[PDB]
Design a protein around this ligand. Sequence first.
Ligand SMILES: Cc1cccc(Nc2ncnc3c2cnn3C)c1
Ligand SMILES: [Zn+2]
Ligand SMILES: [Zn+2]
Ligand SMILES: [Zn+2]
Length: 450
Amino acid sequence: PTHLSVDTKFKTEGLCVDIPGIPKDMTYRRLISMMGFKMNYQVNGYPNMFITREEAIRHVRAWIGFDVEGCHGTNLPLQLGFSTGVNLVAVPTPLMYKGLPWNVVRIKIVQMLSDTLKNLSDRVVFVLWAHGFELTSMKYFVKIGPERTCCLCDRRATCFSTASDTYACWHHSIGFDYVYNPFMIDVQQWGFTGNLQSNHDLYCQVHGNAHVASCDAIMTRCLAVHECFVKRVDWTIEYPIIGDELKINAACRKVQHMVVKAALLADKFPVLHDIGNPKAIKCVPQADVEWKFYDAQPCSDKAYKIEELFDGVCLFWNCNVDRYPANSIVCRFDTRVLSNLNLPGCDGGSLYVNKHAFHTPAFDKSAFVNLKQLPFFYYSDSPCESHGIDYVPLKSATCITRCNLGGAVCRHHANEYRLYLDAYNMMISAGFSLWVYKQFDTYNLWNTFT
Ligand SMILES: Cc1cccc(Nc2ncnc3c2cnn3C)c1
Ligand SMILES: [Zn+2]
Ligand SMILES: [Zn+2]
Ligand SMILES: [Zn+2]
């Protein structure tokens, strides 16, 4: 069992107000045919327009909530809403566009999807709370067929052009008019009682219902993220590299070692309490400190209450708590960050996808009231020696080295400082924020050179 069988039953109760008389007994095969699509018994990488929940989770970066509201359906205009916030009105003759024929609406759909998804995914997964009009509107902007490649590159085709009779991926589809071989999933098939708003509002207070199609599209994708990444968590699923994942992860390890090593040198804590990842390793293995570990998996719903969790210093490296103790070293992902790795999430939270998917609770400035922002600094006690890249003399008050103490930064420590600054800026721009106990002072590191 790899894909969703077309002979699987599709519950049609949610469709019967828009489609009265619809059979209760219905397969994906018959539904796809009713939607105006002919599959022609094809064994060419596209067995079904609909996909399993497991396949949707593997392709979370492709998810686009989609809703169609019958604005007045052959004779009536339709409001097409997307989880990007776009509302397009299609006439059969929070961004709200005026009524236009399908031949121009389809061009906009292709541009919008291509700009949203080109740096995220090789496909689109339309996330529905299906009532009928959305499924029957698909024929006006979707073409299907065998799996194909782009006319300008090796990527799989996501768009088709009637003007040129060619196929393109999301990066090369300028001027294309049809969405080609999209995927879709009906959330309503998962077993819910009551309408979209009542189920969404049980878990989220951030998305309202301004009664437009884009609001429903947003709520649908939000509910789907909640079910698949908040209440259910699968950390075995690996996601492809689409950006700076490796540099960010390597910068995270470098910054963690730097900051913890300096805090231990500056304040000489006898014990460190490492709270988080049950598979954590000592980030400063040469430190004299009594290192004690406490297991906590990432909280994907609400931040851990400090009282419900369980002297010296506490290390919370991505272990999200409601209020950090004053004696802490903290790395907290800022959910508001705009990046190709960070997808919109549930109840203010965000879905951070870097090797694994981590639904992260909303960033809250009040968690850090007992702490202060950790300032940038570079510390090194390694010998001053080049060994082995051109040079311009480094002058910096934050290069905490023996050579800078002696009045002149050596070439080795200048190269290491600049590499560290690049790693630091990478990690910060990825959305990570750093916080520390108020007594932390880098002036206390200079006396480690005596
Ligand atoms: C506390 C903990 C346990 C297990 C793994 C991780 N790893 C993480 N690595 C990177 N980003 C993360 C996370 C958790 N959240 N966010 C946002 C953290
Ligand atoms: Zn291409
Ligand atoms: Zn929501
Ligand atoms: Zn030096």
